[PDB]
Design a protein around this motif. Structure first.
Motif, short mmCIF file in Angstrom:
data_model
loop_
_atom_site.label_atom_id
_atom_site.label_comp_id
_atom_site.label_asym_id
_atom_site.label_seq_id
_atom_site.Cartn_x
_atom_site.Cartn_y
_atom_site.Cartn_z
N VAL A 10 41.84 34.88 41.54
CA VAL A 10 42.02 36.12 42.27
C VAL A 10 40.78 36.98 42.07
O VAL A 10 40.48 37.38 40.95
CB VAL A 10 43.25 36.91 41.76
CG1 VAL A 10 43.49 38.14 42.62
CG2 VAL A 10 44.48 36.02 41.75
N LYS A 12 38.43 40.14 41.97
CA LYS A 12 38.58 41.58 41.71
C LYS A 12 37.24 42.27 41.97
O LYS A 12 36.18 41.74 41.62
CB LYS A 12 39.01 41.85 40.26
CG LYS A 12 40.38 41.27 39.84
CD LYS A 12 41.52 42.02 40.53
CE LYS A 12 42.85 41.38 40.23
NZ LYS A 12 43.88 41.78 41.22
N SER A 46 38.68 34.04 50.51
CA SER A 46 39.77 34.73 49.84
C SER A 46 40.65 35.45 50.85
O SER A 46 40.17 35.84 51.92
CB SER A 46 39.22 35.73 48.84
OG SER A 46 38.60 36.81 49.52
N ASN A 49 44.73 39.66 49.45
CA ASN A 49 44.93 40.07 48.05
C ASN A 49 43.84 39.58 47.10
O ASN A 49 43.90 39.80 45.89
CB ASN A 49 46.30 39.62 47.53
CG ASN A 49 47.45 40.40 48.16
OD1 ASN A 49 48.43 39.81 48.61
ND2 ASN A 49 47.33 41.73 48.18
N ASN A 51 43.20 36.43 46.63
CA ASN A 51 43.56 35.09 46.17
C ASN A 51 42.70 34.05 46.87
O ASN A 51 42.32 34.22 48.03
CB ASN A 51 45.03 34.74 46.46
CG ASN A 51 46.00 35.72 45.85
OD1 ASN A 51 46.99 36.09 46.47
ND2 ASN A 51 45.72 36.15 44.64
N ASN A 105 41.65 36.19 37.05
CA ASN A 105 40.92 37.28 37.70
C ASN A 105 39.43 37.05 37.63
O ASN A 105 38.87 36.91 36.55
CB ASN A 105 41.28 38.62 37.06
CG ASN A 105 42.69 39.08 37.41
OD1 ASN A 105 43.35 38.47 38.25
ND2 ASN A 105 43.15 40.14 36.77
#
Lengths: 117, 117
Positions: A10, A12, A46, A49, A51, A105
């Motif tokens: 994920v 960030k 991605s 979100n 992901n 993350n």
């Protein structure tokens, strides 16, 4: 003999949370590169979100015949100090399916060099 | 403006069930092709059960600015009649995230032309 790899995570971007979305991620094989063959194992972008999951296979030959996987991440997340948006290369452990690499993350606002140096 | 697409499915090869595994699948954008830009939105390889999912984004410009997605499947499944192993192009409906295209069982031992003609 071909071995395949799946990496998930994920993205960030604390400095600009919009920059986790629609981020181009390539899974490439440095061994294929050495052989001047198509080194792009897998490509994903991605989601909303941040992901992502990307799966690729590689089959190498010659002296360097073990796949050597990396993630290449091109993005617009402004580095927290410099506002840099430099591509991020992730060194992916040589861990192949049935094993899956869950990165968790993945921060795009800080680079490996920041700390290392 | 960039739109993204996810396609999923399960490859089937009744004539050689091994041929569903480790199959190279590209999601490409015919509009990007027309523009001589990188047309490869996404790339994946099917897993040991023939499952695949591939997600890509596209951002087109000029006269043809709507993405036009296709799946290109390179495989070794012997066609049931001829033993052909020709690449299979899937015409992907122009249906973008949050929508996801679930193709279901994708047969590699029969071609569109077989029936159409």
């Amino acid at each position: 003999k071909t071995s395949c790899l799946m990496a998930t995570g994920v993205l960030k971007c604390p400095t600009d949370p919009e920059a986790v979305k629609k981020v181009h991620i390539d899974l490439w094989d440095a061994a294929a590169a050495a052989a001047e063959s198509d080194d792009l194992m897998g490509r994903t972008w991605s989601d909303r979100n941040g992901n992502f999951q990307v799966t690729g296979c590689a089959s190498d030959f010659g002296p360097i015949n073990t796949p050597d996987p990396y993630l290449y991440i091109q993005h617009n997340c402004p580095h927290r100090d410099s506002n840099a948006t430099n591509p991020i290369q992730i060194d992916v452990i040589p861990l192949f399916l049935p094993s899956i690499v869950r990165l968790g993350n993945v921060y795009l606002d800080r680079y490996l060099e920041d700390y290392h140096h």
